[PDB]
Design a protein around this ligand. Sequence first.
Ligand SMILES: *[C@@H]1O[C@H](CO)[C@@H](O)[C@H](O)[C@H]1NC(C)=O
Lengths: 64, 49, 42
Amino acid sequence: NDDELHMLMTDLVYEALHFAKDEEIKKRVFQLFELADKAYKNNDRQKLEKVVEELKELLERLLS
Amino acid sequence: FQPTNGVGYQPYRVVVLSFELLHAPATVCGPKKSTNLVKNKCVNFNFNG
Amino acid sequence: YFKIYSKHTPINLRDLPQGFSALEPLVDLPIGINITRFQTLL
Ligand SMILES: *[C@@H]1O[C@H](CO)[C@@H](O)[C@H](O)[C@H]1NC(C)=O
């Protein structure tokens, strides 16, 4: 589901920014958010999924 | 929000009841239970206060 | 508690009439208001 995926995406963005101690991380996360936002608006499932997967990895790295 | 979403993504209605007891009269409380009135017998009674 | 007592009576009178009556509680407001001054509205 595309709305469930979008909700996951914004959740990952919030947490990724929360733990984004440096500027490079914030910039990467914001770029990923923008890409996901556009993919969602244009109903592009594949672009949205790819961005979400990258955000998930990014956050796991910040947490670990 | 969609009717087909999994539970974690379903909408939930939340009501938060914040309870404060500031320096003021406090008339915000539940009902005071009453019993049947008994007459012509020795009873332990409570009428209002 | 802001307590209001009152009494109404007919008069035929420039001053207050002489006589006696007592005022009954009419309203009791559980407000918690800090009152130091007041005004009368016409
Ligand atoms: C009520 O008025 C008194 C003065 O008579 C003042 O000392 C007190 O702080 C006031 N209480 C509140 C809640 O304003």
